[PDB]
Amino acid sequence: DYTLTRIDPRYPLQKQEIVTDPLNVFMGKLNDMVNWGRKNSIWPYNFGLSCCYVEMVTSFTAVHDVARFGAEVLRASPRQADLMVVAGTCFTKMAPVIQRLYDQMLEPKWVISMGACANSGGMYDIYSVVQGVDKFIPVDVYIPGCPPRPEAYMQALMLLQESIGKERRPLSWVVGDQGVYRANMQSERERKRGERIAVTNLRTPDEI
């Protein structure tokens, strides 16, 4: 129920294989402590592409307060950032810039596609748009929407936190196994199918 990824510099320059979860009880507790610290302090790269970035900085404001999750520092440097939110369209002139900024980020790093443009190109199936940011960089969380509302971005933040909290990474670069192990978690569609199909009645659209 895990995937093993090791990188060695077409993009992405990684190869993944399905592997059994390896997990002493002290090493496991240290791994959960490291994962807890990584998931409760996630610093996003302040990267503005399009309208989805306007919704992201709406999520950062007072009526939403994304600071409650410890994800508010909003670094302008990719070295100091933990999370790349592709919040906008992957234009062909901007795609090498996105690749360069993602390369300049440091491990551990995670990617959230925010919006239909970053997911698959969205409505812009046009000559000057890369059809999704997963064509050239690996994505951890996808948010459908055009735009997603700010609480959808927070929901993806919680999904990323839950994905980090059960993934395995080396504690030190001199001791252990240096490959990155990511959990193959259950899809949210199959998890929410029980509560979504049973919905019967909704409020009529003629009211407030």
Binding site: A62, V63, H64, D65, R68, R149, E151, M154, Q155, M158, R196, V199, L202, R203, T204, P205, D206, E207, I208
Partner: protein, 60 residues
């Protein structure tokens, strides 16, 4: 620069600090997602479903 300009600017900085302090003495405007559920209007354009007729058959 003018001394009067300096004094007016000092007073304006003090006024800005005072206003941010009274804004600290205000009510929180944050909607506490996810503990507070997000209210949506009935015609909100979110997740797409297919529905059924009152007889129970699918309407599509």
């Amino acid at each position: 620069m003018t001394l009067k300009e300096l004094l007016v600017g000092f007073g304006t900085q003090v006024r800005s600090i005072w206003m941010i302090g009274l804004h600290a003495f205000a009510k929180r405007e944050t909607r506490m997602y996810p503990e507070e559920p997000v209210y949506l209007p009935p015609r909100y354009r979110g997740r797409i479903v297919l529905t059924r007729d009152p007889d129970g058959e699918e309407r599509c």
